[PDB]
Amino acid sequence: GPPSGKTYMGWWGHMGGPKQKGITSYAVSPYAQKPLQGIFHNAVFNSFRRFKSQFLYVLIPAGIYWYWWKNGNEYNEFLYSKAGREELERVNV
Amino acid sequence: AEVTQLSNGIVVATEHNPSAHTASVGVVFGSGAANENPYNNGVSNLWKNIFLSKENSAVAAKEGLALSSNISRDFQSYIVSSLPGSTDKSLDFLNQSFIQQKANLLSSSNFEATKKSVLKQVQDFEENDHPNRVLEHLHSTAFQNTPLSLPTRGTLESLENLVVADLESFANNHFLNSNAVVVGTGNIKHEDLVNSIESKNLSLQTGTKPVLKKKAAFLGSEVRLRDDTLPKAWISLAVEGEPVNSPNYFVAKLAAQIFGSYNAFEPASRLQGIKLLDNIQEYQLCDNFNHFSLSYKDSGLWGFSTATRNVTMIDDLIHFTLKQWNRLTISVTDTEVERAKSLLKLQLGQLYESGNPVNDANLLGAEVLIKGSKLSLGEAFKKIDAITVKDVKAWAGKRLWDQDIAIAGTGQIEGLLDYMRIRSDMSMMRW
């Protein structure tokens, strides 16, 4: 088979990153550990940290688009009622 | 042939050999590198080079004596070699230079010079000797937080803090009569050696050695000293092995002989009767490997060491070698056991029956400090011959099949996979 072009990923042994020198890693066998260590602690304290950092980027846009929706629903209901017949003719016509 | 006597606390053992042209005497202590702590690591290395110091060894050369010393995990030895008939001076030298007078050796400008030289011996070991520094990290990771994990040479960071007062503490606690064996090998008689010792005082200290709180325990783990500037990869892999005083001591040794050693650049090494060779030769997977079986007082290690330049196919090398270990439990043949019997008897007869009385003194002294006697070579041959195929399968199913492992490596080891992929190879789903 012919060769291919130049990519930004290789395989095992020639992955294509910088030369590494001075870093050491340690690990323990999974058969000698407790898989469920700290689940109760993380479910409350870690969960509170994650929520507190991102909840402002989601709720503010959501509340803006929900207030817009409710204000448009009430206006339409008032327009097609008996008390809104003076406005329905002056807008839709 | 081995004769062992007792005298007021010290043990005298000899291995007489009339055809020898050199006699050797010395003292072997039953304490080694596994009796230190992570803050005084390297004390036993300083005591070795103080004994072989320039001023101490100049005195010995005038009488015609040569000095040697060895440091291990369990024992350390101090030997004096001389011609036959000069054994009286060797005992005299050992008495007044190491046993009874250590003040002249431990003087300033002699401790400060020896410490300078040892600090250089371990600096270049840590950056030039790769195959022997991954076998040391294998001990460090497999016995972590236990006495069987400290390097025998010490640590560079730990050796900069040692002073002369730390060497006197270790000598007072370990160089004792109850922790020592007096050995004599070569051309020297048992009656002559014991008579000389009693003709003098020749008494060590009186106290007993401290006991260790926790014993050594194996833990499946790994350590990765990756270095992308080196041209090769060095890897060591082992499971928990056998202690010295075990019934499966010779069965584990015979198991390592089935896979043996290998040299890619030796024409005769490529023709060995090992079924692993035909897997790793079509594509050159490694340059060399050797299978070991190391035993200690508490535990042991069983596995292999490799060095390869084929950095893109490390996974293939590990996969094929571990698949041959599986056959020790299910399908090991009778021809493989008979061949390994013959090669183990030759290898044992080349280690105990060499021509070096210094090698014999270390071997004999260490075996008496553990079990109080020495097993002869004729009796060991009878035990090796008795091994059967059912014995190997029983031992492998207990120690090898689906067990935790320890891994150490350095160099270009990006192609070495994770722990779980390697540990999956300790068993087969087809069985």
Coordinates of C-alpha atoms in Angstrom, one line a residue:
Chain A
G1 CA 0.0 0.0 0.0
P2 CA 1.1 3.6 -0.7
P3 CA 1.9 6.0 2.1
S4 CA -0.5 8.6 3.4
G5 CA -0.2 12.3 4.3
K6 CA 0.9 14.0 7.4
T7 CA -1.4 13.9 10.4
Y8 CA -1.4 15.1 14.0
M9 CA -1.7 11.7 15.7
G10 CA 0.4 8.5 15.5
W11 CA 0.2 5.1 17.2
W12 CA 1.8 3.4 20.2
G13 CA 5.5 4.2 20.3
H14 CA 5.4 7.1 17.8
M15 CA 2.4 9.1 19.1
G16 CA 3.9 12.4 18.1
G17 CA 4.2 14.6 21.2
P18 CA 7.2 16.3 22.9
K19 CA 10.0 14.3 24.4
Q20 CA 9.3 13.5 28.0
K21 CA 12.0 13.4 30.7
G22 CA 11.7 13.7 34.5
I23 CA 8.1 12.6 35.0
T24 CA 7.4 9.5 37.1
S25 CA 4.0 7.8 37.6
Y26 CA 2.7 5.3 40.2
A27 CA -0.4 3.2 40.3
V28 CA -2.0 0.4 42.3
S29 CA -3.9 -2.6 41.1
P30 CA -7.7 -2.3 41.0
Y31 CA -8.0 -5.7 42.7
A32 CA -6.4 -4.1 45.8
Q33 CA -8.6 -1.0 46.1
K34 CA -12.1 0.1 47.1
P35 CA -14.1 1.1 44.0
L36 CA -16.8 3.0 45.9
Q37 CA -14.5 5.1 48.1
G38 CA -15.9 8.5 48.9
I39 CA -19.1 8.3 46.9
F40 CA -21.3 9.8 49.8
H41 CA -18.8 12.6 50.4
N42 CA -18.6 13.5 46.7
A43 CA -22.3 13.3 46.1
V44 CA -22.9 16.3 48.4
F45 CA -19.7 18.4 48.6
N46 CA -18.2 17.9 45.2
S47 CA -21.7 18.2 43.7
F48 CA -22.2 21.5 45.4
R49 CA -18.9 22.9 44.1
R50 CA -19.7 21.9 40.5
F51 CA -23.2 23.3 40.6
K52 CA -22.2 26.6 42.2
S53 CA -19.7 27.4 39.4
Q54 CA -21.9 26.8 36.3
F55 CA -25.5 27.5 37.4
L56 CA -25.3 31.2 36.5
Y57 CA -24.4 30.6 32.9
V58 CA -27.5 28.4 32.3
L59 CA -30.3 29.9 34.5
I60 CA -30.0 33.6 33.4
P61 CA -30.6 32.8 29.6
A62 CA -33.3 30.3 30.6
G63 CA -35.1 32.9 32.8
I64 CA -34.9 35.5 30.1
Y65 CA -36.5 33.2 27.5
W66 CA -39.1 31.9 29.9
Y67 CA -40.3 35.4 31.0
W68 CA -40.5 36.3 27.3
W69 CA -42.7 33.2 26.6
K70 CA -45.1 33.8 29.5
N71 CA -45.6 37.4 28.7
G72 CA -46.5 36.5 25.1
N73 CA -48.9 33.9 26.1
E74 CA -50.9 36.2 28.4
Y75 CA -51.1 38.9 25.8
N76 CA -52.6 36.5 23.2
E77 CA -55.2 35.2 25.7
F78 CA -56.3 38.8 26.5
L79 CA -56.5 39.6 22.8
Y80 CA -59.0 36.9 22.0
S81 CA -61.2 37.6 25.0
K82 CA -64.3 39.9 25.3
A83 CA -62.2 42.6 26.9
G84 CA -59.7 42.6 24.1
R85 CA -61.9 43.1 21.1
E86 CA -61.0 46.8 20.9
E87 CA -57.3 45.8 20.5
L88 CA -57.7 42.8 18.2
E89 CA -59.2 44.9 15.5
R90 CA -56.6 47.7 15.8
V91 CA -53.6 45.3 15.5
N92 CA -54.4 42.2 13.4
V93 CA -56.3 44.3 10.8
Chain B
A1 CA 31.8 -31.5 54.0
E2 CA 30.5 -28.4 55.7
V3 CA 31.3 -28.5 59.4
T4 CA 29.6 -26.1 61.8
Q5 CA 30.5 -25.5 65.5
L6 CA 29.3 -23.1 68.2
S7 CA 31.4 -21.1 70.6
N8 CA 29.9 -18.7 73.2
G9 CA 27.6 -17.2 70.7
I10 CA 29.5 -17.0 67.4
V11 CA 29.2 -19.8 64.8
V12 CA 32.2 -21.2 63.0
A13 CA 31.6 -22.9 59.6
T14 CA 34.2 -24.2 57.1
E15 CA 34.3 -25.8 53.6
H16 CA 37.7 -27.5 53.4
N17 CA 39.3 -28.0 50.0
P18 CA 42.9 -29.3 49.9
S19 CA 43.3 -28.7 46.2
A20 CA 42.8 -25.0 46.7
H21 CA 45.8 -22.6 46.5
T22 CA 44.2 -19.8 48.6
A23 CA 42.4 -19.7 52.0
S24 CA 39.7 -17.2 53.0
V25 CA 38.3 -16.2 56.4
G26 CA 35.8 -13.5 57.4
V27 CA 32.7 -12.6 59.2
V28 CA 29.1 -12.6 57.8
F29 CA 26.4 -10.6 59.6
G30 CA 22.7 -11.6 59.4
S31 CA 21.6 -8.0 58.9
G32 CA 21.5 -6.1 55.6
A33 CA 19.7 -3.4 53.6
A34 CA 16.3 -4.6 54.8
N35 CA 17.2 -3.5 58.4
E36 CA 17.4 0.2 57.8
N37 CA 14.9 3.1 57.5
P38 CA 14.2 5.6 54.7
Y39 CA 16.4 8.2 56.6
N40 CA 19.5 6.1 57.3
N41 CA 19.4 4.3 54.0
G42 CA 23.0 3.9 52.8
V43 CA 24.7 3.2 56.2
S44 CA 25.7 -0.3 55.2
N45 CA 27.2 1.1 52.0
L46 CA 29.4 3.5 53.9
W47 CA 30.6 0.7 56.2
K48 CA 31.6 -1.3 53.1
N49 CA 33.8 1.4 51.7
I50 CA 35.3 2.3 55.1
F51 CA 36.5 -1.3 55.3
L52 CA 38.0 -1.0 51.8
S53 CA 39.5 2.4 52.5
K54 CA 42.9 3.3 51.2
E55 CA 44.6 3.5 54.6
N56 CA 43.0 0.3 55.8
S57 CA 43.8 -1.6 52.7
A58 CA 47.4 -0.4 52.6
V59 CA 48.1 -2.1 56.0
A60 CA 46.6 -5.3 54.6
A61 CA 48.8 -5.3 51.5
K62 CA 52.0 -5.3 53.4
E63 CA 51.2 -8.7 55.0
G64 CA 49.9 -10.0 51.6
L65 CA 46.2 -9.9 52.2
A66 CA 43.3 -8.8 50.0
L67 CA 39.9 -7.6 51.2
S68 CA 36.4 -8.0 50.0
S69 CA 32.9 -7.0 51.2
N70 CA 29.3 -7.6 49.9
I71 CA 26.0 -5.9 50.9
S72 CA 22.7 -7.6 50.3
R73 CA 19.1 -7.4 51.6
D74 CA 19.6 -9.9 54.4
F75 CA 23.4 -10.2 55.0
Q76 CA 26.7 -8.3 54.8
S77 CA 30.1 -9.9 54.7
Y78 CA 33.7 -8.9 55.3
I79 CA 36.3 -11.2 53.9
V80 CA 40.1 -11.4 54.1
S81 CA 42.0 -13.6 51.5
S82 CA 45.5 -14.9 51.8
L83 CA 47.8 -17.8 50.9
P84 CA 47.5 -21.0 52.9
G85 CA 49.6 -20.9 56.1
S86 CA 49.0 -17.1 56.4
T87 CA 45.6 -17.6 58.0
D88 CA 46.8 -16.4 61.4
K89 CA 47.5 -12.9 60.1
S90 CA 44.1 -12.6 58.4
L91 CA 42.3 -13.3 61.7
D92 CA 44.6 -10.8 63.4
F93 CA 43.9 -8.2 60.8
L94 CA 40.1 -8.6 61.1
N95 CA 40.3 -8.4 64.9
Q96 CA 42.2 -5.2 65.4
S97 CA 40.9 -3.2 62.4
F98 CA 37.2 -4.0 62.2
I99 CA 36.1 -6.0 65.3
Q100 CA 37.8 -4.2 68.2
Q101 CA 39.1 -0.8 66.8
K102 CA 36.9 1.3 64.6
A103 CA 38.0 4.7 65.8
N104 CA 41.0 5.1 63.5
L105 CA 38.9 4.1 60.5
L106 CA 36.1 6.5 61.5
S107 CA 38.4 9.5 61.8
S108 CA 37.7 12.8 60.0
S109 CA 39.2 13.3 56.6
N110 CA 38.7 9.5 56.2
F111 CA 34.9 9.6 56.7
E112 CA 34.7 12.8 54.7
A113 CA 36.7 11.3 51.8
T114 CA 34.8 8.0 51.7
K115 CA 31.5 9.8 51.7
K116 CA 32.7 11.9 48.8
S117 CA 33.5 8.8 46.7
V118 CA 30.2 6.9 47.5
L119 CA 28.1 9.9 46.6
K120 CA 29.7 9.6 43.2
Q121 CA 29.2 5.9 42.9
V122 CA 25.5 6.2 43.3
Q123 CA 25.1 9.3 41.1
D124 CA 26.4 7.5 38.0
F125 CA 24.5 4.3 38.9
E126 CA 21.3 6.3 38.8
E127 CA 21.9 7.6 35.3
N128 CA 24.1 5.1 33.5
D129 CA 23.0 1.6 34.7
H130 CA 19.5 1.2 33.3
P131 CA 18.9 -2.6 33.5
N132 CA 20.0 -2.8 37.2
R133 CA 18.1 0.4 38.2
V134 CA 14.7 -0.9 37.0
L135 CA 15.2 -4.2 38.9
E136 CA 15.7 -2.0 42.0
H137 CA 12.6 0.0 41.3
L138 CA 10.7 -3.3 40.9
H139 CA 11.6 -4.1 44.6
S140 CA 10.7 -0.5 45.6
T141 CA 7.2 -0.7 44.1
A142 CA 6.4 -4.3 44.9
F143 CA 7.3 -4.0 48.6
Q144 CA 6.4 -0.4 49.2
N145 CA 6.2 0.8 52.8
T146 CA 7.9 -2.5 54.0
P147 CA 11.5 -3.2 54.8
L148 CA 12.1 -5.2 51.6
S149 CA 11.8 -2.0 49.4
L150 CA 15.0 -0.1 50.3
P151 CA 17.8 -0.1 47.7
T152 CA 21.0 -1.8 48.9
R153 CA 23.3 1.1 47.7
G154 CA 21.2 3.7 49.5
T155 CA 19.7 6.9 48.2
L156 CA 21.4 10.1 47.0
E157 CA 19.1 12.3 49.0
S158 CA 19.5 10.1 52.1
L159 CA 23.3 9.9 51.9
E160 CA 23.9 13.7 52.1
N161 CA 22.6 13.7 55.7
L162 CA 24.5 10.8 57.2
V163 CA 27.3 11.7 59.7
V164 CA 29.9 9.6 61.6
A165 CA 27.5 9.3 64.6
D166 CA 25.0 7.3 62.5
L167 CA 27.6 4.7 61.6
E168 CA 28.3 4.0 65.3
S169 CA 24.6 3.5 66.0
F170 CA 24.3 0.9 63.3
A171 CA 27.4 -0.9 64.4
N172 CA 26.3 -1.1 68.0
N173 CA 22.9 -2.6 67.0
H174 CA 23.9 -5.2 64.5
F175 CA 27.6 -6.2 64.7
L176 CA 26.9 -8.6 67.5
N177 CA 27.9 -12.2 68.5
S178 CA 24.3 -13.4 68.1
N179 CA 24.1 -11.9 64.6
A180 CA 27.4 -13.2 63.2
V181 CA 28.9 -16.3 61.6
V182 CA 32.7 -16.8 61.2
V183 CA 33.5 -18.5 57.9
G184 CA 36.5 -20.1 56.4
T185 CA 36.8 -21.5 52.8
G186 CA 39.6 -22.8 50.7
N187 CA 42.6 -24.5 52.2
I188 CA 41.9 -24.3 55.9
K189 CA 40.9 -26.9 58.4
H190 CA 38.0 -26.7 60.8
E191 CA 40.1 -27.6 63.8
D192 CA 42.8 -25.0 63.0
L193 CA 40.3 -22.2 62.5
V194 CA 38.4 -22.7 65.8
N195 CA 41.6 -23.2 67.7
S196 CA 42.9 -19.8 66.5
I197 CA 39.7 -18.0 67.5
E198 CA 39.8 -19.3 71.1
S199 CA 43.6 -18.7 71.4
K200 CA 42.6 -15.0 71.1
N201 CA 39.6 -13.2 72.7
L202 CA 37.8 -12.5 69.4
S203 CA 34.4 -11.4 70.9
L204 CA 31.9 -9.0 69.3
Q205 CA 29.4 -7.0 71.2
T206 CA 26.9 -8.5 73.6
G207 CA 23.5 -7.0 72.9
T208 CA 20.7 -8.4 70.6
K209 CA 19.6 -6.9 67.4
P210 CA 16.3 -4.9 67.3
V211 CA 13.2 -6.7 65.8
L212 CA 11.2 -5.2 62.9
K213 CA 7.5 -4.4 63.5
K214 CA 6.0 -5.2 60.2
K215 CA 6.9 -7.9 57.7
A216 CA 7.2 -7.7 54.0
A217 CA 4.0 -7.9 51.9
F218 CA 3.6 -7.9 48.1
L219 CA 1.4 -5.3 46.4
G220 CA 0.4 -5.3 42.8
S221 CA 1.6 -1.9 41.4
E222 CA 3.7 -0.2 38.8
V223 CA 6.2 2.6 38.4
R224 CA 7.1 4.3 35.1
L225 CA 10.4 6.2 34.7
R226 CA 9.8 7.2 31.1
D227 CA 12.8 8.9 29.3
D228 CA 12.5 9.6 25.6
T229 CA 16.2 10.4 25.2
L230 CA 17.4 6.8 25.8
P231 CA 17.7 4.5 22.8
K232 CA 16.1 1.4 24.3
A233 CA 13.4 0.2 26.7
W234 CA 14.1 -1.8 29.9
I235 CA 11.2 -3.6 31.6
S236 CA 10.9 -5.9 34.7
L237 CA 7.8 -7.9 35.5
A238 CA 7.2 -10.3 38.4
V239 CA 4.7 -12.0 40.7
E240 CA 5.2 -12.9 44.4
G241 CA 7.7 -15.7 44.7
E242 CA 9.0 -18.1 47.4
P243 CA 11.0 -17.5 50.6
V244 CA 14.3 -19.3 51.3
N245 CA 12.8 -21.8 53.8
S246 CA 10.0 -23.2 51.6
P247 CA 9.1 -26.6 50.1
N248 CA 8.5 -25.0 46.7
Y249 CA 11.9 -23.5 46.6
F250 CA 13.3 -25.8 43.9
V251 CA 10.1 -26.1 42.0
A252 CA 10.0 -22.3 41.5
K253 CA 13.6 -22.3 40.4
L254 CA 13.0 -25.1 37.9
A255 CA 10.0 -23.1 36.5
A256 CA 12.2 -20.2 35.6
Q257 CA 14.6 -22.5 33.9
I258 CA 12.0 -23.6 31.4
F259 CA 12.0 -20.2 29.8
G260 CA 15.6 -19.4 30.6
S261 CA 17.7 -16.6 29.0
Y262 CA 18.2 -15.4 25.5
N263 CA 20.7 -13.4 23.5
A264 CA 19.7 -12.3 20.0
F265 CA 23.3 -11.8 18.8
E266 CA 24.5 -15.3 19.8
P267 CA 24.0 -17.9 17.1
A268 CA 23.8 -20.8 19.6
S269 CA 21.3 -18.9 21.8
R270 CA 18.8 -18.8 18.9
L271 CA 18.6 -22.6 18.7
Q272 CA 17.5 -23.3 22.3
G273 CA 14.6 -25.7 23.0
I274 CA 12.3 -22.9 24.2
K275 CA 8.8 -22.6 22.6
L276 CA 8.8 -18.9 23.2
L277 CA 11.7 -18.3 20.8
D278 CA 9.7 -19.1 17.6
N279 CA 7.2 -16.3 18.5
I280 CA 9.7 -13.5 19.1
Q281 CA 12.1 -14.3 16.2
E282 CA 10.0 -13.7 13.1
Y283 CA 9.8 -10.0 14.0
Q284 CA 12.8 -9.2 16.3
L285 CA 10.9 -8.3 19.5
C286 CA 13.8 -8.1 22.0
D287 CA 17.6 -8.2 22.2
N288 CA 17.7 -10.3 25.4
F289 CA 15.7 -11.6 28.3
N290 CA 16.3 -13.6 31.5
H291 CA 13.9 -15.4 33.9
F292 CA 14.8 -15.2 37.6
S293 CA 13.5 -16.5 40.9
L294 CA 14.8 -14.4 43.9
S295 CA 14.2 -15.6 47.5
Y296 CA 14.5 -13.8 50.7
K297 CA 13.7 -14.2 54.4
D298 CA 10.0 -13.0 54.1
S299 CA 9.0 -13.3 50.4
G300 CA 10.4 -13.5 46.9
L301 CA 10.0 -12.5 43.3
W302 CA 9.4 -14.6 40.1
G303 CA 9.4 -13.1 36.6
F304 CA 11.7 -11.8 33.8
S305 CA 13.7 -8.8 32.6
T306 CA 13.8 -7.5 29.0
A307 CA 15.6 -4.9 26.9
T308 CA 14.5 -4.1 23.3
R309 CA 15.0 -1.6 20.5
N310 CA 11.7 -2.5 18.8
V311 CA 9.7 0.2 20.6
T312 CA 6.6 -0.1 18.5
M313 CA 5.9 -3.7 19.3
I314 CA 6.4 -3.9 23.1
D315 CA 2.8 -5.1 23.5
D316 CA 3.5 -8.1 21.3
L317 CA 6.6 -9.1 23.4
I318 CA 4.6 -8.9 26.7
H319 CA 1.5 -10.7 25.2
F320 CA 3.5 -13.7 23.9
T321 CA 5.7 -14.2 27.0
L322 CA 2.7 -14.2 29.4
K323 CA 0.8 -16.6 27.2
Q324 CA 3.6 -19.1 27.7
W325 CA 3.4 -18.7 31.4
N326 CA -0.2 -19.9 31.2
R327 CA 0.9 -23.3 29.9
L328 CA 2.6 -24.0 33.2
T329 CA -0.8 -24.5 34.7
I330 CA -2.6 -26.4 31.9
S331 CA -0.3 -28.0 29.3
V332 CA 3.3 -28.2 30.4
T333 CA 4.9 -31.3 28.8
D334 CA 7.2 -34.0 30.1
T335 CA 10.1 -33.1 27.8
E336 CA 10.2 -29.5 29.0
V337 CA 10.5 -30.7 32.6
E338 CA 13.3 -33.1 31.9
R339 CA 15.3 -30.5 30.0
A340 CA 14.9 -27.9 32.7
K341 CA 16.1 -30.5 35.3
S342 CA 19.4 -31.0 33.4
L343 CA 20.1 -27.3 33.0
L344 CA 19.3 -26.5 36.6
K345 CA 21.7 -29.1 37.9
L346 CA 24.4 -27.6 35.7
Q347 CA 23.7 -24.1 36.8
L348 CA 23.7 -25.0 40.5
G349 CA 27.0 -26.9 40.0
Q350 CA 28.6 -23.8 38.5
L351 CA 27.6 -21.5 41.4
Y352 CA 28.5 -23.6 44.4
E353 CA 31.4 -25.4 42.7
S354 CA 33.3 -22.5 41.3
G355 CA 37.0 -21.8 41.9
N356 CA 36.6 -18.7 44.0
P357 CA 36.8 -19.2 47.8
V358 CA 35.4 -15.7 48.2
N359 CA 32.2 -16.6 46.4
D360 CA 31.9 -19.8 48.6
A361 CA 32.3 -17.8 51.8
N362 CA 29.4 -15.5 51.0
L363 CA 27.2 -18.5 49.9
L364 CA 28.0 -20.6 53.0
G365 CA 27.8 -17.8 55.6
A366 CA 24.4 -16.6 54.3
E367 CA 22.8 -20.1 54.4
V368 CA 23.9 -20.7 58.0
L369 CA 22.5 -17.4 59.3
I370 CA 19.1 -18.4 58.1
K371 CA 18.6 -22.1 58.8
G372 CA 21.6 -23.0 60.9
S373 CA 23.2 -25.4 58.4
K374 CA 24.1 -25.8 54.8
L375 CA 22.4 -28.3 52.4
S376 CA 24.9 -30.2 50.3
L377 CA 24.9 -30.3 46.5
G378 CA 24.3 -34.1 46.4
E379 CA 21.0 -33.7 48.4
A380 CA 19.8 -30.9 46.2
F381 CA 20.2 -33.0 43.1
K382 CA 18.0 -35.7 44.7
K383 CA 15.3 -33.1 45.3
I384 CA 15.4 -31.7 41.8
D385 CA 15.2 -35.1 40.3
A386 CA 12.0 -35.9 42.2
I387 CA 10.0 -33.0 40.6
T388 CA 7.1 -34.2 38.4
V389 CA 4.7 -32.5 36.0
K390 CA 1.9 -32.5 38.5
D391 CA 4.1 -30.6 40.9
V392 CA 4.7 -27.8 38.4
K393 CA 1.0 -27.4 37.6
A394 CA 0.1 -27.3 41.2
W395 CA 2.7 -24.6 41.9
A396 CA 1.8 -22.5 38.9
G397 CA -2.0 -22.6 39.6
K398 CA -1.3 -21.2 43.1
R399 CA 1.3 -18.5 42.2
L400 CA 0.8 -17.5 38.6
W401 CA -2.7 -18.2 37.3
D402 CA -4.8 -15.0 37.6
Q403 CA -2.6 -13.1 40.1
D404 CA -1.5 -9.6 40.7
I405 CA 1.8 -8.4 39.2
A406 CA 4.5 -5.7 39.6
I407 CA 5.9 -3.7 36.7
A408 CA 8.9 -1.4 36.4
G409 CA 10.3 0.3 33.3
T410 CA 12.4 3.1 31.9
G411 CA 13.4 4.5 28.5
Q412 CA 11.0 4.6 25.6
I413 CA 8.1 2.9 27.2
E414 CA 5.2 4.7 25.6
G415 CA 4.2 1.5 23.8
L416 CA 3.9 -0.4 27.2
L417 CA 0.1 -0.6 27.8
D418 CA -1.8 0.0 31.0
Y419 CA -1.9 -2.2 34.1
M420 CA -5.3 -3.8 33.3
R421 CA -4.5 -4.8 29.7
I422 CA -1.3 -6.6 31.0
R423 CA -3.0 -8.2 34.0
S424 CA -5.7 -9.7 31.7
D425 CA -3.0 -11.9 30.2
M426 CA -2.4 -13.9 33.4
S427 CA -5.3 -16.2 32.4
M428 CA -7.1 -17.5 29.2
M429 CA -10.8 -17.3 28.5
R430 CA -10.5 -20.4 26.4
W431 CA -9.7 -22.6 29.4

